[PDB]
Amino acid sequence: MRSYLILRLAGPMQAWGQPTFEGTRPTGRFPTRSGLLGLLGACLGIQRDDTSSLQALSESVQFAVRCDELILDDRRVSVTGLRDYHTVLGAREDYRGLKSHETIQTWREYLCDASFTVALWLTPHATMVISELEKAVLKPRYTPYLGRRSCPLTHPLFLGTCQASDPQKALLNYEPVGGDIYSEESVTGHHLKFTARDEPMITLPRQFASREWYVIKG
Protein backbone atom coordinates (compact mmCIF):
# COMPACT_ATOMS: atom_id res chain seq x y z
CA MET A 1 0.00 0.00 0.00
CA ARG A 2 2.79 2.45 0.90
CA SER A 3 6.45 2.52 -0.15
CA TYR A 4 9.17 2.63 2.53
CA LEU A 5 12.90 3.43 2.55
CA ILE A 6 15.00 1.51 5.06
CA LEU A 7 18.17 2.92 6.60
CA ARG A 8 20.66 1.48 9.11
CA LEU A 9 22.35 3.64 11.74
CA ALA A 10 25.30 1.81 13.27
CA GLY A 11 28.73 2.73 14.54
CA PRO A 12 31.01 2.58 17.58
CA MET A 13 29.63 5.74 19.18
CA GLN A 14 26.36 7.67 18.71
CA ALA A 15 24.90 10.92 20.05
CA TRP A 16 21.24 11.95 19.90
CA GLY A 17 20.29 15.20 21.60
CA GLN A 18 18.11 16.27 24.50
CA PRO A 19 17.18 19.77 25.71
CA THR A 20 20.21 21.76 26.85
CA PHE A 21 21.58 25.28 26.93
CA GLU A 22 24.41 24.18 29.16
CA GLY A 23 27.77 22.55 28.58
CA THR A 24 26.56 19.08 29.36
CA ARG A 25 25.51 17.63 26.00
CA PRO A 26 23.11 14.73 26.76
CA THR A 27 22.05 11.76 24.67
CA GLY A 28 18.89 9.69 24.52
CA ARG A 29 18.55 6.00 23.82
CA PHE A 30 17.59 6.29 20.14
CA PRO A 31 17.84 8.82 17.26
CA THR A 32 15.95 12.09 17.49
CA ARG A 33 13.67 13.37 14.76
CA SER A 34 15.75 16.53 14.50
CA GLY A 35 18.67 14.19 14.22
CA LEU A 36 17.30 12.05 11.43
CA LEU A 37 16.10 15.13 9.57
CA GLY A 38 19.60 16.43 9.95
CA LEU A 39 21.12 13.24 8.62
CA LEU A 40 18.97 13.15 5.53
CA GLY A 41 19.40 16.88 5.24
CA ALA A 42 23.12 16.21 5.29
CA CYS A 43 23.19 13.56 2.60
CA LEU A 44 21.20 16.04 0.55
CA GLY A 45 23.42 19.08 0.11
CA ILE A 46 21.36 21.40 2.26
CA GLN A 47 23.11 24.50 3.60
CA ARG A 48 21.98 25.70 7.02
CA ASP A 49 20.21 28.89 5.94
CA ASP A 50 18.19 27.17 3.18
CA THR A 51 15.05 27.28 5.33
CA SER A 52 13.02 26.32 2.29
CA SER A 53 14.82 23.04 1.66
CA LEU A 54 14.77 22.37 5.38
CA GLN A 55 11.04 22.84 5.57
CA ALA A 56 10.43 20.86 2.37
CA LEU A 57 12.35 17.94 3.86
CA SER A 58 10.64 18.22 7.22
CA GLU A 59 7.05 18.21 5.97
CA SER A 60 7.80 15.59 3.36
CA VAL A 61 9.34 12.82 5.49
CA GLN A 62 8.34 10.73 8.51
CA PHE A 63 10.28 8.16 10.56
CA ALA A 64 9.98 4.99 12.60
CA VAL A 65 13.03 3.78 14.47
CA ARG A 66 13.89 0.31 15.71
CA CYS A 67 16.48 -0.50 18.34
CA ASP A 68 18.65 -3.46 17.43
CA GLU A 69 20.50 -5.24 20.20
CA LEU A 70 23.94 -6.65 19.52
CA ILE A 71 24.69 -10.32 19.65
CA LEU A 72 28.32 -11.27 19.65
CA ASP A 73 29.54 -14.79 19.52
CA ASP A 74 26.13 -15.54 20.87
CA ARG A 75 26.12 -13.37 23.91
CA ARG A 76 23.81 -10.40 24.24
CA VAL A 77 25.33 -6.92 24.47
CA SER A 78 23.24 -4.17 26.03
CA VAL A 79 23.71 -0.59 24.89
CA THR A 80 25.84 1.38 27.28
CA GLY A 81 26.61 5.04 27.80
CA LEU A 82 29.78 7.11 27.76
CA ARG A 83 30.66 10.52 29.19
CA ASP A 84 33.45 12.51 27.61
CA TYR A 85 35.16 15.33 29.45
CA HIS A 86 35.74 17.53 26.43
CA THR A 87 37.64 20.79 26.76
CA VAL A 88 38.18 23.73 24.43
CA LEU A 89 41.02 26.18 24.70
CA GLY A 90 40.85 29.42 22.77
CA ALA A 91 37.06 29.36 22.88
CA ARG A 92 35.17 32.52 22.00
CA GLU A 93 34.13 34.80 24.82
CA ASP A 94 31.50 36.75 22.88
CA TYR A 95 29.51 36.20 19.69
CA ARG A 96 31.42 39.16 18.36
CA GLY A 97 35.11 39.93 18.70
CA LEU A 98 38.32 37.98 19.12
CA LYS A 99 38.73 37.68 22.86
CA SER A 100 38.81 34.10 24.06
CA HIS A 101 38.76 32.09 27.26
CA GLU A 102 41.91 30.25 28.30
CA THR A 103 39.95 27.05 28.73
CA ILE A 104 36.31 26.01 28.83
CA GLN A 105 34.82 22.61 29.57
CA THR A 106 31.92 20.57 28.20
CA TRP A 107 30.69 17.07 29.00
CA ARG A 108 29.38 15.15 26.02
CA GLU A 109 27.50 11.86 26.22
CA TYR A 110 27.72 9.14 23.59
CA LEU A 111 26.00 5.80 23.05
CA CYS A 112 28.13 2.68 22.89
CA ASP A 113 27.30 -0.48 20.96
CA ALA A 114 24.18 1.09 19.57
CA SER A 115 22.65 -0.02 16.31
CA PHE A 116 19.37 1.10 14.75
CA THR A 117 17.19 0.26 11.79
CA VAL A 118 15.00 3.11 10.55
CA ALA A 119 12.06 3.17 8.16
CA LEU A 120 11.01 6.40 6.48
CA TRP A 121 8.11 7.35 4.23
CA LEU A 122 6.39 10.25 2.48
CA THR A 123 3.49 12.30 3.83
CA PRO A 124 0.40 13.50 1.91
CA HIS A 125 1.79 17.02 1.63
CA ALA A 126 5.18 15.90 0.38
CA THR A 127 7.24 18.12 -1.90
CA MET A 128 9.72 15.32 -2.47
CA VAL A 129 9.86 11.74 -3.68
CA ILE A 130 11.48 8.67 -2.16
CA SER A 131 14.17 8.08 -4.87
CA GLU A 132 15.59 11.55 -4.20
CA LEU A 133 16.15 10.27 -0.71
CA GLU A 134 17.48 6.89 -1.86
CA LYS A 135 19.72 8.59 -4.38
CA ALA A 136 21.11 10.83 -1.65
CA VAL A 137 21.65 8.08 0.92
CA LEU A 138 23.66 6.22 -1.69
CA LYS A 139 25.68 9.28 -2.73
CA PRO A 140 25.59 11.96 -0.03
CA ARG A 141 26.95 15.45 -0.70
CA TYR A 142 27.93 16.40 2.83
CA THR A 143 29.60 13.97 5.21
CA PRO A 144 26.99 11.95 7.15
CA TYR A 145 27.35 10.92 10.77
CA LEU A 146 25.59 9.46 13.77
CA GLY A 147 24.87 12.54 15.85
CA ARG A 148 28.28 14.20 16.04
CA ARG A 149 30.95 14.51 13.37
CA SER A 150 33.15 12.21 15.41
CA CYS A 151 30.87 9.24 14.96
CA PRO A 152 31.36 7.47 11.62
CA LEU A 153 29.25 4.66 10.30
CA THR A 154 30.32 1.02 10.30
CA HIS A 155 27.54 0.07 7.91
CA PRO A 156 26.15 1.71 4.75
CA LEU A 157 23.33 4.14 5.40
CA PHE A 158 21.12 2.41 2.86
CA LEU A 159 19.68 -0.89 3.94
CA GLY A 160 16.83 -1.49 1.52
CA THR A 161 13.46 -0.48 0.09
CA CYS A 162 10.04 -2.12 0.26
CA GLN A 163 6.29 -1.55 0.72
CA ALA A 164 3.45 -2.33 3.14
CA SER A 165 0.70 -0.78 5.29
CA ASP A 166 2.52 -0.52 8.63
CA PRO A 167 5.94 0.87 9.34
CA GLN A 168 6.15 -2.16 11.60
CA LYS A 169 5.30 -4.53 8.77
CA ALA A 170 7.91 -2.85 6.60
CA LEU A 171 10.51 -3.28 9.30
CA LEU A 172 9.71 -6.97 9.62
CA ASN A 173 11.64 -7.74 6.41
CA TYR A 174 14.97 -6.63 7.81
CA GLU A 175 16.75 -8.44 10.59
CA PRO A 176 17.35 -8.42 13.46
CA VAL A 177 13.69 -8.41 14.45
CA GLY A 178 12.33 -8.16 17.97
CA GLY A 179 13.48 -4.66 18.84
CA ASP A 180 11.30 -1.86 20.16
CA ILE A 181 9.93 0.53 17.55
CA TYR A 182 9.16 4.23 17.81
CA SER A 183 6.92 5.48 15.02
CA GLU A 184 5.37 8.77 14.04
CA GLU A 185 2.54 6.65 12.67
CA SER A 186 0.12 4.87 15.00
CA VAL A 187 -0.21 1.10 14.92
CA THR A 188 -3.63 -0.27 15.82
CA GLY A 189 -2.50 -2.75 18.46
CA HIS A 190 -0.51 -0.33 20.58
CA HIS A 191 -1.55 2.54 22.83
CA LEU A 192 1.69 3.65 24.44
CA LYS A 193 3.43 6.91 23.56
CA PHE A 194 6.79 8.51 24.35
CA THR A 195 7.13 12.26 24.90
CA ALA A 196 10.04 14.04 23.28
CA ARG A 197 11.30 17.39 22.08
CA ASP A 198 12.53 16.30 18.65
CA GLU A 199 10.77 18.72 16.29
CA PRO A 200 13.03 21.46 14.90
CA MET A 201 11.22 24.77 14.51
CA ILE A 202 12.81 25.85 11.24
CA THR A 203 11.48 29.41 11.55
CA LEU A 204 13.48 29.66 14.76
CA PRO A 205 17.11 28.50 14.42
CA ARG A 206 18.27 25.90 16.94
CA GLN A 207 15.02 25.59 18.84
CA PHE A 208 12.82 22.54 19.27
CA ALA A 209 9.18 21.79 20.02
CA SER A 210 7.54 18.89 21.84
CA ARG A 211 6.21 15.86 20.04
CA GLU A 212 5.27 12.27 20.76
CA TRP A 213 6.38 8.88 19.51
CA TYR A 214 4.14 5.87 19.18
CA VAL A 215 5.68 2.95 21.02
CA ILE A 216 5.49 -0.57 19.68
CA LYS A 217 7.23 -2.93 22.08
CA GLY A 218 8.76 -6.15 20.79
Partner 1 sequence: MNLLIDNWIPVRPRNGGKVQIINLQSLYCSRDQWRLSLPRDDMELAALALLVCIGQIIAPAKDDVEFRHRIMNPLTEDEFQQLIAPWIDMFYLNHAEHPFMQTKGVKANDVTPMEKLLAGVSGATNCAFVNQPGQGEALCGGCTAIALFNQANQAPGFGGGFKSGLRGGTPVTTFVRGIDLRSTVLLNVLTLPRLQKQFPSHTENQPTWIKPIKSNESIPASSIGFVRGLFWQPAHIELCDPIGIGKCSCCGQESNLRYTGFLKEKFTFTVNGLWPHPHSPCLVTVKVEEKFLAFTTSAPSWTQISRVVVDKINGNRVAAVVNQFRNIAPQSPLELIMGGYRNNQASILERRHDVLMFNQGWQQYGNVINEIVTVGLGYKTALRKALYTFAEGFGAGVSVHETAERHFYRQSELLIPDVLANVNFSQADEVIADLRDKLHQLCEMLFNQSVAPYAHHPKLISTLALARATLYKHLRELKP
Partner 2 sequence: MSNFINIHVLISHSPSCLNRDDMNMQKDAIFGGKRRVRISSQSLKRAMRKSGYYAQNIGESSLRTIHLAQLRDVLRQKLGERFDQKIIDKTLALLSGKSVDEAEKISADAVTPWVVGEIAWFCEQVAKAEADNLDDKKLLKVLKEDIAAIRVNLQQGVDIALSGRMATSGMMTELGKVDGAMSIAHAITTHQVDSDIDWFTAVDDLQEQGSAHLGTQEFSSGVFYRYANINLAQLQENLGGASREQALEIATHVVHMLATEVPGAKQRTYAAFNPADMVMVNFSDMPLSMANAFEKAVKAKDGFLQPSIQAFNQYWDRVANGYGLNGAAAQFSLSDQVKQMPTLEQLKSWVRNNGEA
Q: What is the contact mask toward partner 1 in residues 11 to 40, using x (rule: CB under 8 A)? A: --------xxxxxxx---------------
Residue 122, beta-bridge partner list: 61
Q: Nearest approach, Cβ of 190 to partner 2 (angstroms)?
A: 31
Q: In this chain, which stretch among 95-103, 124-132, 159-167, 180-188 interacts with partner 2, using CB under 8 A?
A: 95-103
Q: In this chain, which stretch among 61-69, 80-88, 118-126, 190-198 interacts with partner 2, using CB under 8 A?
A: 80-88
Residue 81, beta-bridge partner list: 111
- Which residue from 120, 122, 157, 216 is in contact with partner 2, where contact means CB under 8 A? 157
Q: What whole-number distance in Å separates Cα of residue 66 and Cα of residue 118?
A: 6
Determine how many CB atoms are found less than 10 A away from the CB of residue 98: 7
Instruction: For residue 147, state whether it binds partner 2 (rule: CB under 8 A).
Output: no
**From the list partner 1, partner 2, none, which binds 193 (C-beta under 5 to 8 Å, kind-based)?**
none
User: Distances from the Cα of 92 to the Cαs of 104, 166, 189, 206, in angstroms?
Assistant: 10, 48, 52, 19
Instruction: For residue 203, state whether it binds partner 1 (rule: CB under 8 A).
Output: yes
Q: In the complex with partner 2, which residue's Cβ is closer, 54 or 216?
A: 54
Q: What whole-number distance in Å separates Cα of residue 212 and Cα of residue 215?
A: 9
Instruction: For residue 88, state whether it binds partner 1 (rule: CB under 8 A).
Output: yes
Q: With beta carbons less than 8 A apart as the criterion, state whether 44 and 139 touch.
A: no
Selection from 101, 82, 210 nearest residue 148 by Cα: 82
Q: In the complex with partner 2, which residue's Cβ is closer, 34 or 183?
A: 34
User: Distances from the Cα of 200 to the Cαs of 38, 80, 125, 145, 211, in angstroms?
Assistant: 10, 27, 18, 18, 10
Q: What is the contact mask toward partner 2 in residues 53 to 72, using x (rule: CB under 8 A)? A: -----------------x-x
Antiparallel, parallel or unpaired: β 208-216 and 193-200: antiparallel
- Which residue from 7, 13, 39, 171 is in contact with partner 2, where contact means CB under 8 A? 13
Query: Residues interacting with partner 2, by CB under 8 A?
Result: 11-13, 47-49, 70, 72-73, 75, 77, 80, 82, 84-93, 95-100, 105, 110, 112-113, 138-145, 149-158, 205
